[PDB]
Each structure stands twice: as C-alpha cells, then as structure tokens.
C-alpha cells in the first residue's frame, strides 16, 4: 500500500536516492540540458525548481548558500546558480524546467526524458507544437468564437 507516497524508491536507499538526484541536478545546472531515465528526471524536476527558488533568495541568505553547497557537488556552479540562473528567472515565478520524453534507451530500452532549464543557450528542443490556427477545425472554432463575441 503506497497511498499518498510521493517519492520514488531509487538507488540503494534514501541517501542513495538523494545522491543520485544530486548528481543529476548538478549535471542539469552545469549543462542546462540533461537526458536521463524518465522517472529520475521526474523526481529531480522538483529539486531543480527548488534550487532555482533558493538562488532567487540570494547569495547573502546563509540558508540558500548552504542548500546550494549541499546540492551542487561542483562548487563552481554555486556562483552560476546565484548569478546566471536566478537572475534569468527573476521575472518568472515557476516552470523553470522543461521535461520531454525521448525515444527509449538503446541499451536497456529504458524510458528516458530530457530536462532543460528554459532560456538556455543550447539549441532548442523539437518541442511539440499544437495544430495551426488555420486548420479546418481551428477555423471552425474561430468562427464559433467570433459568433459568440458578436452576440455579446
């Protein structure tokens, strides 16, 4: 029975789970785009958002500095976290990460996903785009909208 359990059981235990997520998140902070098993990316997305929030908190915040020191195993990324990512997202309030499924791993056919920080310098992902507004159905719905607006 796992009603309400929100954390996956990963690695060799709770500590190993935290360390795996920490390594994935350090890689994400360094490269701004990381491909990894789908479940691990899903688990680490929340921690990535939380680091962005802690970076928003600021350098002077000792709690934020301690959190960054723990979570970024490569200490050169803490200045990055506090001076490149948080300033980038200062305007935003959330949704700093884009996660998209990827064709299964060639080795073990594992469900993989790519997670990136939005606005990175890397080439854009082939994002799935909704159907154009000029399609038949979309044009009919536009006619509906125009008729309703004219009525009101």
């Amino acid at each position: 029975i796992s009603h309400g359990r929100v954390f996956r059981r990963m690695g060799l235990g709770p500590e190993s789970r935290i360390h795996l997520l920490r390594n994935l998140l350090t890689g994400l902070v360094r490269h701004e785009r990381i491909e990894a098993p789908w479940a691990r990316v899903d688990e680490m997305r929340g921690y990535a958002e939380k680091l962005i929030d802690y970076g928003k908190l600021g350098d002077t915040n000792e709690r934020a500095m301690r959190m960054a020191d723990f979570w970024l195993t490569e200490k050169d990324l803490i200045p990055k976290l506090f001076q490149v990512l948080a300033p980038r997202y200062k305007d935003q309030t959330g949704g700093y990460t884009r996660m998209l499924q990827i064709p299964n791993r060639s080795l073990d056919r594992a469900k993989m996903a790519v997670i990136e920080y939005k606005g990175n310098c890397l080439p854009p992902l082939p994002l799935p785009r909704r159907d154009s507004h000029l399609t038949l159905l979309n044009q009919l719905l536009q006619g509906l909208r125009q008729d309703l607006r004219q009525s009101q």
Binding site: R130, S132, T135, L137, N138, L141, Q142, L144, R145, L148
Partner: protein, 305 residues
C-alpha cells in the same frame, strides 16, 4: 483509426476558448435546474407509512469531532452533496422489481472523458455528465421528475441513514492483514513462515473449499455502514454530518439513503418526503440545523449542573 482526445487538434487560441465555453455551458445548465417546482413538477404526494424516498450521492470531505450536551465526543464525517440531480425514473412494471427506481447522479465531470451514449443521455436530460450514478428503490409516491436537484437538507438532524461506498483499496494483501490471521512466531526456529497461511484445508477432501480465506485483493469493494445518525446539516454548503466513519477514502462519492434498520422503519413522517425543495421557500432554512443534543459552536461552555 488512431485514438483522439479533445485537445489533440485544438490550437493554442482555441483550447482556452473551448474550456471557457464548455465550463460556462455546464454552469448555465446547472443553474437552469435551480427552480424545479416552477417547471412542471411531478405530483407531490403526502408521506404515508411504507413509503421509501430517494437518497443522495455525497462526497466524503473528512472527519471532525462533535460534542453533545452530555459532554461526550463523537467523530462525525462530512458528506458534501456536489451537483446531485435525479436523472432517470423507471416504474414498478418497467424495472420488473418490487419497487420503482430513481437514478441519481453526482459530482459533475468533464464531458470530454465520457462515452458517446452517456453524453447523449446527459444532453437530452439537460445536465452535465455526473461522476457517479446510483439507483435508489422507492415507492411511486416518491417519484421525482428527472433533472431535479437534491440538497443536503433532504435529510434532517436526528435522522438515521445508511452510507454505501467503495472501501479504500489495499491491493493484493497477505492473509494476515486481509483476514487477521495470527500468523507464525517470529523466532523459535520458524523457517520462512511468519505471515503465511497455515493449513488451507484437510488431507481427506484433497481440495480447497470454495470461499477459503486466502491472500488476495482487499478493499475497493462496495460496503455499507448502517444506522449512522445525522448530527447536523449545513445548508449553505450542502453538507451532512454523519455519525461515525463511512467506507471509502476522502473525496470519495458515497451513496446516502434513509436507514433500513427495523428500529428506524417509519421515522420519515417529518422528513421532506419526496425531497427538500428550496424553491418552495416556505421558510428559508437556517445556515446550520443541529440535533437537539449537539453542543452548537457559539454556545456557552457546558456545565454539568
């Protein structure tokens, strides 16, 4: 050939427009049924002995304490009536049963996730599709026109009610948890047997009796709690405060109907027989109706004189 969903071919501009339009239509349909007595209501017969009225489909909100004037605590569950409407009526002859049947639907859900037949039925009825539809056996005296809304005030404090719901599903559970078997000792030599069932049968029969208690799926079945007292009614939010526990998880839909226990056979004399009709407006009910023994909030601290 390929499966489709309502958002598959909708553009960025049309998605929010469709959401807003459908939500507006649903709320308009819900509001259109707020005046049943002014829309050719079916005859309202007086209560008679042996009459069985319709019930409701509520939503288990949670639990809270409730103290009675004798200084006794009682755990009381909250059942919220969320968009409960009568949907279908079948007479004695039509249903072939001993009593007529009223279908009651609750917890309006998205129209994009329902079968075409259900969508057609709800479109004809004039209401948005409901999460759950349950059948209540009634006498012809209590027939109600389909589409009429039902409210938590349909019940009243002091009444005794029966609540049916799907129990919390515990999945494939071992014999110890499922049937409360004692199990085997943890120590004193026991090799790989601590929670296993013992002998499942006897040697002679050379088989296992049907109905033998064995490990298997537990919960997620319909169970009924009988004779729960209705301590209080919140008419503003359409909430019933039902004594004790009820089957199912929080935010689960529970079918609520008058108690079938023999002791409570003919206590529906003073209850709204067909159903409570706010449109009648004989006397706007207070925000909260309390049973006589309930220590109402806002009342002086009880002193045992």
């Amino acid at each position: 050939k390929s499966g489709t969903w309502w958002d598959e071919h909708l553009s960025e501009e049309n998605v929010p427009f469709i959401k807003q339009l459908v939500s507006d239509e649903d709320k308009a349909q819900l509001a259109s049924k707020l005046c049943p007595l002014k829309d050719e209501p079916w005859p309202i017969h007086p209560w008679e002995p042996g009459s069985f009225r319709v019930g409701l489909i509520a939503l288990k909100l949670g639990m809270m304490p409730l103290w009675t004037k004798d200084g006794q605590k009682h755990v009381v569950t909250l059942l919220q009536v969320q968009d409960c409407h009568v949907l279908k009526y079948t007479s004695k002859e039509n249903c072939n049963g001993k009593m007529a049947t009223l279908s009651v639907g609750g917890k309006t859900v998205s129209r994009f996730r329902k079968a075409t037949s259900i969508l057609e039925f709800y479109r004809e009825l004039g209401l948005p599709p409901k999460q759950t539809v349950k059948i209540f056996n009634i006498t012809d005296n209590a027939a109600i026109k389909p589409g009429t809304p039902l409210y938590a005030a349909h019940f009243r404090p002091g009444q005794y009610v029966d609540v049916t719901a799907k129990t919390i599903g515990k999945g494939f559970q071992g014999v110890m948890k499922r049937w409360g078997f004692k199990g085997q000792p943890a120590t004193h030599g026991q090799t790989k047997t601590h929670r296993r069932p013992g002998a499942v049968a006897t040697g002679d029969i050379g088989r296992v009796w049907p109905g033998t208690k064995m490990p298997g799926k537990m919960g997620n079945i319909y169970r009924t709690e009988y004779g729960l007292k209705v301590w209080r009614i919140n008419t503003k939010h359409n909430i019933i405060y039902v004594n004790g526990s009820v089957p199912g998880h929080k935010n689960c839909l529970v079918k609520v109907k008058d108690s079938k226990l023999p002791a409570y056979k003919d206590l529906g004399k003073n209850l709204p027989f067909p159903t409570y009709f706010p449109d009648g407006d004989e006397e706007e009910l207070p925000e909260d109706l309390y049973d006589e023994n309930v220590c109402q909030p806002g009342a002086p601290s009880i002193t045992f004189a």
